[PDB]
């Protein structure tokens, strides 16, 4: 069969997850001798798969893209995700990515939020409240001091949302990441 019709019956057939990232899972399955490598953004039906212990109930579906400038990582990182990459030894295996089949290998890269998100200053609430709006179905934001471990703090929102800043965020170091954007949260005493 085709992997994108075979990698979905994980519950049915013997499966084994190989890697759990911040935003998708890499698992394979065995259907009558054949082995099917594949990656998905949905944890539905991967509990009878071997190595499911650290699997989250849900995977954040925000828009994410790999980070290419290694300096930007400490500031823009919001976790890791799995991606299809070309094999260096010219031996790509067949792997299905989010129900899309292709030949390649699987690699885990650090990622950053991406997409169109507009960040304005609110008027209804206190001076430390902002209004983030995005045209895409689901957009992620994250308040992060550069170098913090807050990979699961990525909040998702459809349409618009509002964020009142807390005092611990109000030092000049914290930055608001929303898709392609990064705004400094001003220091105010």
Q: Which residues bind ligand NAG (CB under 6 A)?
A: 5, 8-9, 12, 94, 101-103
**Looking at 99-107, 115-123, 149-157, 165-173, which segment touches a copy of itself (CB under 8 A)?**
99-107
Under DSSP, is residue 94 helix (H, G, I), strand (E, B) or coil?
strand
20 burial level (CB within 10 Å; 0-12, 13-18, 19+):
buried
* Among 1, 5, 11, 102, contact with a copy of itself (rule: CB under 8 A): 102
Q: Which is nearer to a copy of itself, 37 or 134 (CB)?
A: 37
Which one, of 27, 46, 49, 45, lies nearest residue 37 by Cα?
A: 27
If one asks whether residue 53 binds a copy of itself (CB under 8 A), the answer comes out as no
The Cα–Cα gap between 73 and 87 comes to 24
Pairing type for strands 93-97 and 34-40 reads parallel
87 vs 188 by CB, closer to ligand NAG = 87
State the nearest-atom distance from the C-beta of 36 to a copy of itself, in Å: 17
Q: What's the rounded Cα separation, in Å, for the pair 8 and 93?
A: 18
**Residues of this chain that bind a copy of itself (CB under 8 A):** 18-19, 26, 65-66, 68, 70-71, 80, 83-88, 97, 100, 102, 105-110
């Amino acid at each position: 069969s085709d992997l994108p019709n075979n990698c979905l019956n994980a519950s049915s057939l013997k499966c084994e997850i190989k890697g759990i990232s911040t935003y998708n899972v890499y698992y394979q399955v065995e259907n009558n001798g054949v082995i099917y490598s594949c990656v998905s953004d949905s944890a539905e039906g991967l509990e009878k798969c071997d190595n499911s212990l650290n699997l989250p109930k849900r995977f954040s579906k925000v828009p994410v893209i790999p980070i290419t400038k290694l300096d930007n990582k400490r500031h823009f990182s919001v976790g890791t995700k799995f991606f299809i990459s070309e094999s260096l030894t010219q031996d790509n295996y067949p792997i299905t990515y989010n129900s899309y089949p292709t030949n390649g290998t699987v690699s885990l890269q650090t990622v950053k939020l991406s997409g169109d998100c507009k960040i304005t200053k609110s008027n209804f609430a206190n001076p430390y409240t902002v209004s983030i709006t995005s045209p895409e179905k689901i957009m992620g934001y994250l308040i992060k001091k550069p170098g913090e471990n807050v990979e699961h703090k990525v909040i998702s929102f459809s349409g618009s949302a509002s964020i009142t800043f807390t005092e611990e965020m109000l030092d000049g170091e914290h930055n608001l990441l929303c898709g392609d954007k990064s705004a400094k949260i001003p220091k105010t005493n």
